[PDB]
Design a protein around this ligand. Structure first.
Ligand SMILES: CNc1ccccc1S(C)(=O)=O
Lengths: 412, 412
């Protein structure tokens, strides 16, 4: 058998706020974090907007010297991790440090640092490249730097599954705990691809909404006028903890992580299949993992990227998995407000899923003024919806057809 | 409840060969794959050699049309995965495709591709960035593209844990199978970091051997005259399979994967602790996972990177874990010949560890002319050593203090 896993700590940077409570306040009020990108020449760019982290003060976490060594994506992940550990009340000791590990991931990693060192390399040659270039840019350094700062000696690793990273990181962190390899994990993702290469890279595949005139209306999941996703920056981190360990120290328990599903589409490199057959296997895999019937599910935090193919596949997948219960559950895209944090999407959407359990409220899908063909589900258009939520799903479907589902249940 | 996991297929690109048997012949013959780099101009670089893959034909595997869109690390990963799958004899069907997944990882991923696109952006503008920049560079697309070409709908993901990536990728794929999420996984890693930023960033950190006038003698693990690691390119892939599923189809079984350990040093971003404390915790986790007496270990494929700190830390970790039996087992670093394939190091060295079991031979540490202070173990100096091997161990240690150990034994 298997150990139960609870959420005792959460931390976040998002386009809505510099922590969980501020972010969640924006989500429930349907506020957008999307705005034209600043201190950056986007003249030659079809997209000039996204969700930036506004007002981040790294010196709340690190000395200036330590922050100078680390890509913004690493900074954002340490921030959410430090918040989550502090939010949990956990005390690390010689007696438990071998049982506390970290799995913080990223989709794309250190593009901002890769750019600035590229500038150096091309202008002046190799001897101007930072000595800290490699360890300050690679994706396993949020786990690395966190483990070194707090003295964590348990499982130490990093996932990179594109837009599925956050969901995969939390899910496989839960497995470490359930099968007795750890009592505590910090898990989630961080991302800062709002650079030239990120905007350019996604710009060149014309993946991005180009609604420059109305940045707050660009992200419109399931709306007939959607024209691709909105690039956003940030981090989410959860403290996952074995239930008996959490109870023994009297932890505040937000919710229980009951299920994790994974699937591969084996379809296309960036597009999901029109019927969402891969997202459907993943959700069924996640429900079976939790020993739950589809009928027991109340809330889904969609991937809901605002791409023509993605949004429609997810409707197909939900109708397929949930049959005559598909209208009864509420499903919303918090990306209507946050845009798409890529590797960190799944981490902040796990937190929104946990807070939907705490607060008994479905976050809105904003900008859903004209549901597309067959988008006739309860997508919680425009405003938040109080309702009963025992069981909440969080879905992520990424490049390479990599799928993740997390199942959270109310704990009392 | 926990199932057993065997190896039924292996695949490789190394500086010694374009497959396993060719690579392994070089290993047993003590041949160096290290040579001055020809694919770029390094006269401005303090290090000008590495373990290049020689004469790779991507069109043994993929269309030139697809190949052109993919960073070499992805081409190298697919090449290794296709070999391993072929070598397995496995036929993907509707009956088994949901039960076959992939976990192929990388330390750094498509730096070459990110660099070249960066050069396009800075010299020409954002409009010259490939539309294939993101899907052709990000680390999870080895898992993604393999799943699409072969129709694998099992768990689909990628680790990035720096120089531990290969060992972790293989260990965790075994856990997928062990605990019922899959019956088959293609697992390992791939790296092509030999670009300006790669050789530049490792150079800026003074991590690399600067023995430009004798590259075949650069990599000399435990030798008193070692001066840093040698940067190499390539890929390893293994087909991991549930034992009864392997029996059920009359699979040829190279060996059984009985043990996997992880730990964190929680010490330093790039430096290992001189006492090998985190490495010791990791091997002990692995031996306890395998239910072994540490005296059962016959062969250790060491991380053996040829850095001053790394090499001596490993000796300490192995004396601390094995006590007097540390003087009975054989330990060698095939990095003496291949150099350090970073995130692929663990994947090719897992294969060397399995072939050590098949052939009953300890591969040599070449260039070990003058063992350093305290390096008094059986390090298989100079020449392969025929000997009884029932249990083989493969260690990796990375930036962020992240440790991985795999335990193989003969299967009958
Ligand atoms: C028991 N561990 C397990 C089980 C299923 C999937 C993944 C893992 S992992 C990567 O954490 O090793």
């Amino acid at each position: 058998s298997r150990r139960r896993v609870v959420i005792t700590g959460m931390g976040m940077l998002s386009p809505l706020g510099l922590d969980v409570p501020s972010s969640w306040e924006g989500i429930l009020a349907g506020r957008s974090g999307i705005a034209p990108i600043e201190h950056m020449d986007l003249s030659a760019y079809s997209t000039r907007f996204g969700g930036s982290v506004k007002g981040f003060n790294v010196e709340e976490y690190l000395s200036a010297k330590e922050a100078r060594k680390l890509d913004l994506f690493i900074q954002y992940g340490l921030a959410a991790s430090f918040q989550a550990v502090r939010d949990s009340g956990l005390e690390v000791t010689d007696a438990n440090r071998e049982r506390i590990g970290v799995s913080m991931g990223s989709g794309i990693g250190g593009l901002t640092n890769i750019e600035n060192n590229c500038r150096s390399l091309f202008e002046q040659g190799p001897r101007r490249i930072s000595p800290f270039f490699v360890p300050g840019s690679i994706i396993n350094m949020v786990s690395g730097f966190l483990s070194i700062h707090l003295g964590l000696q348990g499982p130490n690793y990093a996932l990179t599954t594109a837009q599925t990273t956050g969901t995969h990181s939390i899910g496989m962190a839960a497995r470490n705990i359930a099968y007795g390899e750890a009592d505590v994990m910090v898990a989630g993702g961080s991302e800062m691809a709002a650079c030239g290469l990120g905007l350019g890279g996604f710009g060149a595949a014309r993946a991005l909404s180009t609604r420059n005139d109305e940045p707050t209306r660009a992200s419109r999941p399931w709306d007939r006028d959607r024209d691709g996703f909105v690039l956003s920056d940030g981090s989410g981190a959860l403290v996952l903890e074995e239930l008996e360990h959490a109870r023994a120290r009297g932890a505040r328990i937000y919710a229980e992580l009951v299920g994790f599903g994974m699937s591969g589409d084996a379809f296309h490199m960036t597009a999901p299949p029109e019927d969402g057959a891969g997202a459907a296997r993943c959700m069924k895999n996640a429900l079976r993992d939790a020993g739950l019937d589809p009928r027991q599910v109340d809330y889904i935090n969609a991937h809901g990227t605002s791409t023509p193919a993605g949004d429609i596949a997810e409707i197909a997948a939900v109708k397929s998995v949930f049959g005559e219960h598909a209208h009864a559950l509420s499903m919303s895209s918090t990306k209507s407000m946050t845009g798409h944090l890529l590797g960190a999407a799944g981490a902040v959407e796990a937190i929104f899923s946990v807070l939907a359990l705490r607060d008994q409220v479905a976050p809105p899908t904003i900008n859903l003024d004209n549901p597309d063909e067959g988008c006739d589900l309860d997508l919680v258009a425009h405003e938040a919806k109080p309702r009963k939520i025992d069981v909440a799903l969080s879905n992520s479907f990424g490049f390479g057809g990599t799928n993740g589902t997390l199942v959270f249940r109310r704990f009392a």
